[PDB]
Amino acid sequence: MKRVRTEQIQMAVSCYLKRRQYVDSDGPLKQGLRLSQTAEEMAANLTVQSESGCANIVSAAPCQAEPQQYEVQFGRLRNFLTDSDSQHSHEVMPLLYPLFVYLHLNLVQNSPKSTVESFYSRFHGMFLQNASQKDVIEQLQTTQTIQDILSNFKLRAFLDNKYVVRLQEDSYNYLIRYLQSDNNTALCKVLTLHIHLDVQPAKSLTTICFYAFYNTEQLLNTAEISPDSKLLAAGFDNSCIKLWSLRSKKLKSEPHQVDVSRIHLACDILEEEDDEDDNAGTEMKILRGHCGPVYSTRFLADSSGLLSCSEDMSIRYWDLGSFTNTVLYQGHAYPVWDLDISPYSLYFASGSHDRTARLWSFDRTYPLRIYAGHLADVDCVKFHPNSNYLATGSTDKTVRLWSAQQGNSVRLFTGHRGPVLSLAFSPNGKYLASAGEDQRLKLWDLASGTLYKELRGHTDNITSLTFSPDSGLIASASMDNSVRVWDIRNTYCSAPADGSSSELVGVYTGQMSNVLSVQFMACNLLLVTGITQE
Amino acid sequence: TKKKLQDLVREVDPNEQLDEDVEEMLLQIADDFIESVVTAACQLARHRKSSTLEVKDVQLHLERQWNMWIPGFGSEEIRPYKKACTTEAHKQRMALIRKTTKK
Amino acid sequence: SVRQKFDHRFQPQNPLSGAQQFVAKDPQDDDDLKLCSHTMMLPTRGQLEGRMIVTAYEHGLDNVTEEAVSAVVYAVENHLKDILTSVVSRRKAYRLRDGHFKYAFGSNVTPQPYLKNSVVAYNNLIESPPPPPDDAEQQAALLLACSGDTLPASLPPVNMYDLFEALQVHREVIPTHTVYALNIERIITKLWHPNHEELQQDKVHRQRLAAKEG
Amino acid sequence: TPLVDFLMQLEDYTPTIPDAVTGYYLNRAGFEASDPRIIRLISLAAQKFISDIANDALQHCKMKGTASSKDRKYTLTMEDLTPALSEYGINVKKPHYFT
Amino acid sequence: LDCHYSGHHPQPASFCTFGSRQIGRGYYVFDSRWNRLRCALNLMVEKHLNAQL
Amino acid sequence: MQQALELALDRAEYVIESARQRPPKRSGRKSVFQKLYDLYIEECEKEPEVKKLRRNVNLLEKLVMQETLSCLVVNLYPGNEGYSLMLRGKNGSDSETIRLPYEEGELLEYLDAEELPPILVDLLEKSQVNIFHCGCVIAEIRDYRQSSNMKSPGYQSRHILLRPTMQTLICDVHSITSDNHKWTQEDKLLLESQLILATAEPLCLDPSIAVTCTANRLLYNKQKMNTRPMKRCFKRYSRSSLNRQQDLSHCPPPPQLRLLDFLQKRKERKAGQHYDLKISKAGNCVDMWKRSPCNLAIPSEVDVEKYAKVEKSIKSDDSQPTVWPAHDVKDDYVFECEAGTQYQKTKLTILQSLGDPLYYGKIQPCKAHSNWFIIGSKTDAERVVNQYQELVQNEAKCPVKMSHSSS
Amino acid sequence: KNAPRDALVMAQILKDMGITEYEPRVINQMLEFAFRYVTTILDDAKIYSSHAKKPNVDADDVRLAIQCRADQSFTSPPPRDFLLDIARQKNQTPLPLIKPYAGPRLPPDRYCLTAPNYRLKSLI
Amino acid sequence: EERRFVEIPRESVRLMAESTGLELSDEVAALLAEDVCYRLREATQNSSQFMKHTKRRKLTVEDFNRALRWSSVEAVCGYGSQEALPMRPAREGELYFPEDREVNLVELALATNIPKGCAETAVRVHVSYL
């Protein structure tokens, strides 16, 4: 009754791998290299796995034994595709030929003689004008038993391969709207097994800029700056978000009929106030609408709008045309901790007290993917530079990299002594940094999934990280009210004032209380935020 | 007699009607409800070494947890209100603190 | 000082260590349950007994008193009606008697409280001492007039979002944690609304139907 | 004697609760606290809530000593608050002495 | 004059399982829906083991 | 921005095209996935026969015949029969399970998505067979749901790959740690990390959103037919739904239709009527005005002139026309009480004079001057006579008699 | 010294979790919390014992009362196992097909906070 | 490898149970003590979680009540004053209690105490080179 040893773990892992037949019938010390790949070979892998099975069999096929239907379904489809006078009815026309051939061929393998002849008679006279297809249409005429299909040469390639068709997204949705309108199960089976539709989209040292908030009084929680460096947003314990204009311009809203931070009685009139030019702008705005302490505010890639999360387990999108909440995403039953947006504003994810993170799109108000597997609160989340992988920190001292599209854990690092609080990817997509209460800064090597570097020196909780646009330097902020920049690149030094010697470049602990944020910009710029008192 | 969700809905409001997903969800919730209630009643029966799951077990559980009182099963089990009296030592310390406060 | 910093942290007790152990019985045809998810109906008195006995067995009992079956059936119906009431309250007006008893769930009477006429009608038509047809017709007309809804509108059938909001708000209709926690997550994963493309196809189909009608 | 409409009456009801408190509470839920009508109504609801508890507490205090006069100082003890609060599902259990 | 202390983290006398049940080795469920299928499969494997002898 | 997205989409399209056409080429035992990749590589080289068709479309179903592989079979019997599982033995033997109904569709959901259920593995490991192939388990789906040929095969053998999922990995972690040793949380996490590292898909670590565009396109095309409305439509006609519908035929009708009940119960009582004068069942037609074209046969002999008569007229000279009333026509009526009472018996006199077809009247009181009035015609004269008689009787309030006279 | 033993216990707990500083009355709050929890558990045990028709209470009654209390009040999110099942059932659905955008696309209006109350009248 | 966890004494649990009016045995007291300690530690962890996401070190009573509310537990009322509540020992020297002074209501009822509002937030920019 004793704690297992380090080697015993490898022993059990090898036993598992052998039992499930993953490695050869010997010590696969040769094996264990395929831990990365390039774009083209990833595409090849995914294409091989895409055709290595059928997405839907059991439910996609009809169960009632009523051969009369095969006529009715095809007849209704033909009638609908005929009277239509749309440009889609064009693009969704070519499908009829593979549909007929495959429906007839499947009738043959199970259908009493009465049905097939009526079928051939009822529709055959529309696949003649073209020459390339008259051949097989006529060939089918003399075919009753299965030996017909196996014997013949042209029927075979049809039977053992799929027919290709090309559609736009709009056209495919045109077919789906009809398919769902009523029982069309037989056609769904044919499309599932035999036809292969293909849908594609239609056509010289650094300089620090610092910011300080004076009158906060234990209420400021977080702050951020937009990419184009024109706005400054902050959240507060008392539910509210305040916005400032960095430039010399003022902020003025435009006409809008509806506002949720307002209450009207039954005896009111919706009127657009005209006594408005009197204002003609201001330097600050208060955004209202959350009913709990706010914990994160993020900008879009193009500074168009703002997104935020709050203790009230809601996520709100703010329109900077009018500085008003206009969308509301509800996908949680517990307070939401963190938030994050993808590089080109395609997705955004959120960690929550419910032990899970969730994927969202800016055009649907309900989650799309769920990443379960952590043992406790998911406190941190960050997208990959390519926007295809997802890292998340948790209070269980673990970090997991996820596959965005598919949604399963691909890596699991361990080694932290306490909960984790931040994450950061280098823009070359090679490393991943993480920091927590342990006061150690670890960079991981994604490809190998092993510790790459460890930095020490901070004496209190580290709560932010960021890389330079050339993976040159990594900046960190701690609860000791300090900002330290680091360099990992080969350039070595001899300055061992503490544990880490050659990486610690600069330290900045001026007159400043708790820090808030750290960023980088185009040219050696490092924006900071926090509160002070003096 | 056969029973459907719409039959219950009519009792509450005749003119309303649900979607299909809501109908599935409500039945799932009912399954969970039964699975919890029966287990709790069985444990309450197990407490007193009894051999049979009597109704009074269900009555006690429903009253205490779900605040539900089903009316047509008699009043054989209603606890008679007590005095809820205190002990010597307690009153002793209370008197001591009263004294220490007086002067 | 740092090394002994995370040795006294909190260690939550895993909820599965106290999980119930499952024992396999004889697979018979007669030993079946009919969980309501399978049969889309409320379980009858007889069907409930089969599963009640089966559950009782794993706890070392003999049988059920047969008054318990009635109580459980009544309670299940009561609980479902409670949830339905919670969901209904969020999208229709209603009245109150004795301060909590809600009966008339239409959207009719609801006198607008900011009209001098409404103030007067409230004092009389509400406090009635505890009805010829002409008088009743007159007073019904008056109540509809005071309501203020000149052009009333209606809602689509009840969908997932209504259930989610109702459950989040009230939350006293499911006091037990186990039932609420497991089902709320399920409800979340069934939220849905048509996206842009589907609405475009609805547009097209409406054009088509209008044309074929002319 | 008069029966003016509700909004005319509301302008005369002065609430004990200050307006700034109601504004504080409205700002938590994310509302702009500038409409006087909403402030008045919320304050009045809170006042009613407190008044009912006060009335019940005073009645319970009156009934306490009956068996075994008017001129006496009425003071409020936890034994008067507990039953009054319990009407609203508030279970008050407070220690007396520690160690 | 020392606060009494123990050598192990405390544990709750009774806690809240979520109505879960453990099917076999290393698998837990919450709804009783796999009961029928598990009985069937167990018998199948029993017999398939009997015949190899 | 839009420009960067267009660049990334072009890159993704190019990569997809090239990977489809020009695959790159990447042991004692060669993995099942290795064999799949190789059979894919081969199929690219070939050319198809038909235009608008492809070859590399079923890498599994083709790689089945190319050798023996141990699979798990599923039997989907028709009607309300159910489904069952088979497990081929080492000895040309077999085993099969009870037939489970089509309502308990818990397993079919797993099959519908190609996901390995976790209940299956715990037993399949106990059954000492090597049916696993790199985690995944190949399965064969036979269904007699639709067939009326009464043949030997009578099923369509489909093959699918049940990939393992995160549920299976957590179950495995639970299973390995249940050994006699102790395990601390850190150690469990280490084990899980090693397992994930070993069996995870390779990572395409590269900073460019072309990667995500390619991945989105491929995955979307993989699963573009699992929209919520699709699944609702499938579920709406599945077998369990039909079984539920049949039960509904016996529920009673709502209110406002009780009239059907009244009519049904009434009809049974009886039917009868004496002196039934109807002779038509189709007497309840609408266009009763229609008349068939009827051809009558010529009568043998028509005898109209026996009854026709001409009226006398004053024949015409060459200056004046005929004038038919041949003589003055006079009619008189008298009325009297006949009692001793004084009643002043009165007289009425209709007249039609010579050569004048108009009628006239006069009501002077009979003895014991020229007040004529125009009366229209013979029918009018009869009307006037009747009305006068009625008036005289109603005014007399006693017996009164009518004495008619001519010319 | 000034404090009783319980205050020291609570301060030690706060230290254990890693709390450096805090408002003073927090400790009084924690003391009241513990007192209320204990008293309510005992009161429930009384009822559960009197249900079993027996003399003064014992271990089993208390454990049953604690189980009933924990089934209601002291809660926390479901475990990893259940979440994995729901996640599997969720991820099968397809994601939107990317395309060039002049900025991120918002969802349709019928599902956005941009609808005025229909009762209200509008003015020009 | 050796570690400690302060726990309340059996005597405190028996003293609490006394107010109820029940004489408790030996095993039951330790059972209750361990259960109460576990609940206290759970609640404290939950409270600390909310403070973690605000960048402030002091823990308020609002945080504790918030954590209690999310865990579906009634809240504790009467300790939100931001001012110390000194304890008092009795004569013997083993029992303690909190000071609870009687207060004359009418004085507070009839009194004007204007409060000072708060000041608006503002941000100054502060550049530097290094």
PDB file of C-alpha atoms in Angstrom, chain A residues 19 22-23 53 91 132 150 152 203 216 219 254 257 279 288 299 311 362-363 371 398 401 405 411 473 493 506 530-531:
ATOM      1  CA  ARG A  19      -3.355  -4.144 -25.234  1.00  0.00           C
ATOM      2  CA  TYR A  22      -1.124   0.930 -30.919  1.00  0.00           C
ATOM      3  CA  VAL A  23       2.500  -0.220 -31.263  1.00  0.00           C
ATOM      4  CA  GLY A  53     -16.516   5.717 -42.419  1.00  0.00           C
ATOM      5  CA  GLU A  91     -27.874  24.667 -59.417  1.00  0.00           C
ATOM      6  CA  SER A 132     -22.411  10.712 -72.107  1.00  0.00           C
ATOM      7  CA  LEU A 150     -21.646  -7.241 -60.660  1.00  0.00           C
ATOM      8  CA  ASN A 152     -21.667  -5.335 -66.098  1.00  0.00           C
ATOM      9  CA  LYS A 203     -17.579  34.377 -53.684  1.00  0.00           C
ATOM     10  CA  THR A 216     -11.302  53.888  -7.684  1.00  0.00           C
ATOM     11  CA  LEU A 219     -13.555  48.792  -7.181  1.00  0.00           C
ATOM     12  CA  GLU A 254     -25.899  58.242 -32.454  1.00  0.00           C
ATOM     13  CA  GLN A 257     -34.562  53.790 -30.120  1.00  0.00           C
ATOM     14  CA  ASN A 279     -23.738  67.724 -25.883  1.00  0.00           C
ATOM     15  CA  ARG A 288     -24.484  49.768 -17.853  1.00  0.00           C
ATOM     16  CA  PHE A 299     -11.964  44.469 -27.833  1.00  0.00           C
ATOM     17  CA  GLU A 311     -20.473  37.421 -12.207  1.00  0.00           C
ATOM     18  CA  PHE A 362     -20.395  36.154 -33.025  1.00  0.00           C
ATOM     19  CA  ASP A 363     -23.575  35.310 -34.979  1.00  0.00           C
ATOM     20  CA  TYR A 371     -14.345  21.373 -23.516  1.00  0.00           C
ATOM     21  CA  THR A 398      -2.983  21.752 -14.879  1.00  0.00           C
ATOM     22  CA  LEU A 401      -4.417  22.345 -25.095  1.00  0.00           C
ATOM     23  CA  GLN A 405     -12.926  22.397 -34.340  1.00  0.00           C
ATOM     24  CA  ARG A 411      -2.009  17.857 -24.404  1.00  0.00           C
ATOM     25  CA  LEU A 473      10.768  39.327 -24.990  1.00  0.00           C
ATOM     26  CA  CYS A 493      24.416  37.333 -19.724  1.00  0.00           C
ATOM     27  CA  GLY A 506      14.733  45.036 -16.838  1.00  0.00           C
ATOM     28  CA  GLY A 530      -2.757  50.069 -12.737  1.00  0.00           C
ATOM     29  CA  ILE A 531      -3.677  52.195  -9.757  1.00  0.00           C
TER      30      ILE A 531
END
